[PDB]
Amino acid sequence: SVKAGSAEDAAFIMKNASKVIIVPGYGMAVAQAQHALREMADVLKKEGVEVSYAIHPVAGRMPGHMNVLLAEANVPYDEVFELEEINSSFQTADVAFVIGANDVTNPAAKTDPSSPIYGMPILDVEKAGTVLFIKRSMASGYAGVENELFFRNNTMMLFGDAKKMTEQIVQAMN
Amino acid sequence: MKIAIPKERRPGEDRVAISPEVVKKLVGLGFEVIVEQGAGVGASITDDALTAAGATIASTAAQALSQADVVWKVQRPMTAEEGTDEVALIKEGAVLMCHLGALTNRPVVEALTKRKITAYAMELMPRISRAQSMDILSSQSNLAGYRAVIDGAYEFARAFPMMMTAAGTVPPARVLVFGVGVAGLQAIATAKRLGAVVMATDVRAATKEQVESLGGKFITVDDEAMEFRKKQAEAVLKELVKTDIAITTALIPGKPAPVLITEEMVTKMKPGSVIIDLAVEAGGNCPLSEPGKIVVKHGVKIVGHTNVPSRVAADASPLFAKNLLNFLTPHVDKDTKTLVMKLEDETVSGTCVTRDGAIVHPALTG
Amino acid sequence: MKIAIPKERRPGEDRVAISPEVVKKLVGLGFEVIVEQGAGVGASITDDALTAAGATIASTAAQALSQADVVWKVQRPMTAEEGTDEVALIKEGAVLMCHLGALTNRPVVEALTKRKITAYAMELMPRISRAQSMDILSSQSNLAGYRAVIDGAYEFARAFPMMMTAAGTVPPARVLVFGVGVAGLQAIATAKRLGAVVMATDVRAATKEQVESLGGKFITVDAGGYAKEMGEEFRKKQAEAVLKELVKTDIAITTALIPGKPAPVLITEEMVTKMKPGSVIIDLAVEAGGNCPLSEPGKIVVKHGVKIVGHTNVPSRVAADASPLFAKNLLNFLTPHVDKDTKTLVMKLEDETVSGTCVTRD
Numbered sequence: 055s056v057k058a059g060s061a062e063d064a065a066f067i068m069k070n071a072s073k074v075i076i077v078p079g080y081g082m083a084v085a086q087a088q089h090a091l092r093e094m095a096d097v098l099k100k101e102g103v104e105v106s107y108a109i110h111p112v113a114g115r116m117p118g119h120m121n122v123l124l125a126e127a128n129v130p131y132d133e134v135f136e137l138e139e140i141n142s143s144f145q146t147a148d149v150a151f152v153i154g155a156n157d158v159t160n161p162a163a164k165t166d167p168s169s170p171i172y173g174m175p176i177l178d179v180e181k182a183g184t185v186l187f188i189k190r191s192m193a194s195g196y197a198g199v200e201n202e203l204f205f206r207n208n209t210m211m212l213f214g215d216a217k218k219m220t221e222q223i224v225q226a227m228n
Numbered sequence: 229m230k231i232a233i234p235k236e237r238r239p240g241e242d243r244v245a246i247s248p249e250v251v252k253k254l255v256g257l258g259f260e261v262i263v264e265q266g267a268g269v270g271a272s273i274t275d276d277a278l279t280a281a282g283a284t285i286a287s288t289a290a291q292a293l294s295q296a297d298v299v300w301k302v303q304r305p306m307t308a309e310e311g312t313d314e315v316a317l318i319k320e321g322a323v324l325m326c327h328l329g330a331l332t333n334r335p336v337v338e339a340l341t342k343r344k345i346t347a348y349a350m351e352l353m354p355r356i357s358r359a360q361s362m363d364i365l366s367s368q369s370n371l372a373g374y375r376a377v378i379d380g381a382y383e384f385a386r387a388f389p390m391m392m393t394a395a396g397t398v399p400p401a402r403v404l405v406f407g408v409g410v411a412g413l414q415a416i417a418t419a420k421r422l423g424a425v426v427m428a429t430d431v432r433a434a435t436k437e438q439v440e441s442l443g444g445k446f447i448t449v450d451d452e453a454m455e456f457r458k459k460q461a462e463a464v465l466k467e468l469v470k471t472d473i474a475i476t477t478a479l480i481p482g483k484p485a486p487v488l489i490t491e492e493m494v495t496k497m498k499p500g501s502v503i504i505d506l507a508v509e510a511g512g513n514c515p516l517s518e519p520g521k522i523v524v525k526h527g528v529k530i531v532g533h534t535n536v537p538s539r540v541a542a543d544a545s546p547l548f549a550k551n552l553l554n555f556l557t558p559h560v561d562k563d564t565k566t567l568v569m570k571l572e573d574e575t576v577s578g579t580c581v582t583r584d585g586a587i588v589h590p591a592l593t594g
Numbered sequence: 595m596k597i598a599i600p601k602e603r604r605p606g607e608d609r610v611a612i613s614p615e616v617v618k619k620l621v622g623l624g625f626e627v628i629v630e631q632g633a634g635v636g637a638s639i640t641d642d643a644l645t646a647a648g649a650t651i652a653s654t655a656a657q658a659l660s661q662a663d664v665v666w667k668v669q670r671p672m673t674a675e676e677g678t679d680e681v682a683l684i685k686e687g688a689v690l691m692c693h694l695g696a697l698t699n700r701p702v703v704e705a706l707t708k709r710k711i712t713a714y715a716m717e718l719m720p721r722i723s724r725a726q727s728m729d730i731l732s733s734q735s736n737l738a739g740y741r742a743v744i745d746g747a748y749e750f751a752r753a754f755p756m757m758m759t760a761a762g763t764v765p766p767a768r769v770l771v772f773g774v775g776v777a778g779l780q781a782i783a784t785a786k787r788l789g790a791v792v793m794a795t796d797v798r799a800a801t802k803e804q805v806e807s808l809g810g811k812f813i814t815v816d817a818g819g820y821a822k823e824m825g826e827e828f829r830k831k832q833a834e835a836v837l838k839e840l841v842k843t844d845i846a847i848t849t850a851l852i853p854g855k856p857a858p859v860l861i862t863e864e865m866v867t868k869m870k871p872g873s874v875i876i877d878l879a880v881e882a883g884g885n886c887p888l889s890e891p892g893k894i895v896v897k898h899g900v901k902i903v904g905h906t907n908v909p910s911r912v913a914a915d916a917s918p919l920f921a922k923n924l925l926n927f928l929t930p931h932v933d934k935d936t937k938t939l940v941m942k943l944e945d946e947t948v949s950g951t952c953v954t955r956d
């Protein structure tokens with residue numbers, strides 16, 4: 055019933071990875087963590103790690119919501135990818151840093167035909183080595199439904215605010 | 229079977245229900261795409277690139293729709309009662325997909341019914357996650373929100389971004405967005421990136437987070453701190469008085485646009501300012517705005533362009549074409565060239581207005 | 595010692611050589627400031643705001659320069675030959691400062707001369723650095739660059755920023771800026787802000803790094819403050835590595851210019867005719883011949899599926915910000931010569947700020 059984690063943890067998980075792809079969502083924007091994320095990334099690919107962004111079409115609360123924020127923080131266009139031209143890369147990825155996402159990764163979209171989020175395509179974060187969720191609590195997202203991916207083998211719960219929590223994860227990663 | 233796209237005859241409507249990318253997908257689904265020539269000129273889609281995609285070109289509207297089993301367009305077809313009978317051109321028994329504006333245009337719905345046409349009014353699309361790729365309401369409103377800032381920048385005599393120069397400093401433009409739906413969100417985004425100091429206000433309290441998620445500053449009478457709290461409009465006025473560009477996006481389905489800026493208010497504003505009323509086609513959020521023109525009183529340019537999305541027809545169109553295609557694809561099949569709409573599909577039951585001679589949709593007094 | 599600011603009359607001019615911040619500072623120097631009523635309408639500067647600043651308001655333009663010892667204006671005065679002799683109002687024996695457009699308007703230089711008026715053409719300012727704060731070229735051309743991306747965006751049927759949406763991805767507008775000077779750099783900045791993918795080229799070497807630190811990507815082709823011609827052999831080598839990007843470009847802003855000469859041709863028909871349909875070209879050099887032949891001053895031209903914009907007096911399309919700035923350029927030029935309480939302008943003469951600026955000083 056849910057595994058939790060801390061800044062140092064995540065710092066470790068991601069620091070010793072080959073491929074890590076970010077997954078910004080409405081959370082990442084409520085906390086205005088564009089830059090903190092842009093940092094954790096350039097000093098992740100500084101070690102040598104492989105970084106990319108998985109922008110899901112309805113991420114956030116408006117069309118292009120993650121796009122404007124990432125752009126404000128200067129994340130190179132060629133690092134940002136759309137749900138389709140990248141969903142196949144999670145399989146061969148060590149970590150899926152889900153900073154602010156939730157409903158966008160919920161597998162109940164492919165499964166439980168009883169759900170409100172049924173049918174909507176999603177990024178394959180579950181098909182990744184290890185998941186790294188971030189969120190102030192255990193509340194649901196827009197849809198208002200628990201994301202089962204929340205508690206399972208490689209799913210972490212780095213509870214807290216996205217800007218702070220990403221700011222610390224940057225810190226303990228020098 | 230045969231699907232066809234005509235040119236948009238309604239005045240000041242440069243959009244088109246098609247795109248190269250989508251032609252190729254339609255073809256791929258066993259269709260025979262036909263499009264009236266020059267139907268995408270205003271959207272920068274040439275018959276050349278349109279054919280190069282897999283689509284045949286027709287000389288006239290009449291000829292394109294001639295014998296199509298499925299027809300797509302952006303605005304509802306024109307009836308005989310309007311001067312041009314396009315609905316007449318559509319083949320009897322055909323399928324029509326477009327922005328019908330059904331619940332607000334009983335006539336066209338009836339016109340279509342005569343000819344036993346089956347119409348799916350895209351704007352009635354259900355709000356359900358798996359259909360966000362089918363929502364034309366947000367795809368277009370989104371580009372219109374973008375456009376308001378651009379139109380606003382255009383009419384304002386100062387730059388948006390603050391600029392420190394050798395000759396001195398010029399302060400940032402201040403924007404105030406009323407209504408935080410999709411259009412207003414993209415507005416805040418576009419204004420901020422340009423460098424404006426954006427403020428936003430909306431009666432739905434859940435709005436504060438959204439607004440802040442874009443860098444905005446929600447307007448609140450927080451003497452309190454989330455009788456007649458009606459003096460909320462005094463916090464607003466306090467900000468509107470320092471505003472340079474004010475963008476109003478409040479809209480209600482089937483009812484007149486709710487006044488958001490009283491003339492009594494446009495007076496208290498500063499000379500040189502401009503108000504963008506995306507609600508103009510519905511009475512406007514500002515009673516001074518006039519459908520199609522930029523009126524000036526009290527020193528404020530109250531802009532009221534109509535069909536804003538069309539002002540971004542080059543992008544508006546392909547998005548719109550994708551909405552149509554995503555709606556249709558799940559119904560095309562083997563029979564290897566026939567389409568069937570399972571009535572169990574909510575997407576089909578809430579979008580359909582009339583089927584084979586009979587207005588079906590509940591809300592339409594039948 | 596009075597100094598007044600009339601109301602600009604030339605068509606389309608909404609700028610004014612004055613602002614509250616500067617009136618308060620001119621009063622401080624000892625001048626009584628007189629401004630024509632309504633003179634600030636276009637620049638949104640109100641009469642009441644100029645009043646509270648310390649200036650005096652004049653009922654008519656006629657009554658304005660009527661006693662003014664020094665006159666500040668944006669554009670060069672209109673001779674009787676142009677419509678209504680303004681040089682005829684300027685109290686004979688006074689000093690007039692403004693964008694006189696000296697070098698290419700001898701007819702005005704002689705009109706002010708019969709009035710025994712001393713004028714300083716602000717565009718002739720030396721390219722020396724202690725003059726940045728006096729350069730009306732830079733202050734105005736800086737807002738022009740901003741306004742280009744805007745006008746460009748207004749005429750473009752697409753949106754600038756990339757947006758991944760439920761209906762597909764709207765790709766980023768690709769902008770190309772010809773001439774990375776002051777206006778070019780601002781255009782690059784403003785274009786990037788909106789989310790475009792900016793491309794830039796210029797003949798000057800330093801240029802390349804400035805483009806890289808603003809976010810742009812330099813298109814490497816192949817002087818006391820600018821550049822000279824490059825010759826037909828270069829222009830060719832240019833259009834060669836330019837065209838490659840020019841085909842994918844959505845908005846192209848040309849700003850190249852060449853001291854006392856005609857604007858360098860940068861985008862020929864053979865080239866516009868190779869751009870994607872719907873594209874837009876903003877020609878900021880149009881009043882000097884443009885960098886693209888097709889452009890025509892004061893009008894937008896559609897040809898070959900391209901929109902070649904070419905407004906005139908772009909800085910006036912940003913009047914409200916251009917004014918304060920132009921106004922301060924004047925204040926910074928004048929102040930070093932107003933002598934320590936003597937209510938008199940002793941223009942240093944040996945000062946290159948005064949030498950290469952004064953056209954007539956009867």
Ligand SMILES: NC(=O)c1ccc[n+]([C@@H]2O[C@H](COP(=O)([O-])OP(=O)(O)OC[C@H]3O[C@@H](n4cnc5c(N)ncnc54)[C@H](OP(=O)(O)O)[C@@H]3O)[C@@H](O)[C@H]2O)c1
Pocket residue numbers: 078079080081082084085111112113114115116117119154155156157158159188189190191192193194195196197214215216217357
């Ligand atoms: N794209 C659009 O235009 C649009 C429009 C309408 C609806 N939607 C819907 O909204 C969803 C968007 O996808 P999403 O992944 O972003 O889903 P959500 O919107 O479902 O996910 C929100 C995530 O952010 C967290 N959060 C809130 N404040 C936070 C903070 N300060 N720091 C860190 N986290 C914070 C939430 O939980 P905590 O509160 O526990 O932190 C949660 O983990 C989709 O379900 C879509 O159907 C999208």
Ligand SMILES: NC(=O)c1ccc[n+]([C@@H]2O[C@H](COP(=O)([O-])OP(=O)(O)OC[C@H]3O[C@@H](n4cnc5c(N)ncnc54)[C@H](O)[C@@H]3O)[C@@H](O)[C@H]2O)c1
Pocket residue numbers: 720721722723725726729731732735772773774775776777795796797798819820821824849850851852853858
């Ligand atoms: N006194 C001062 O402080 C001062 C005043 C003015 C200009 N400057 C300096 O001068 C430089 C430029 O000033 P400007 O913007 O006013 O110049 P400008 O407006 O006359 O030049 C515009 C641009 O045209 C470019 N250009 C001309 N022909 C070209 C061709 N064939 N191909 C490509 N590019 C071509 C120029 O090199 C320049 O960058 C800047 O680096 C600026 O700082 C300094």
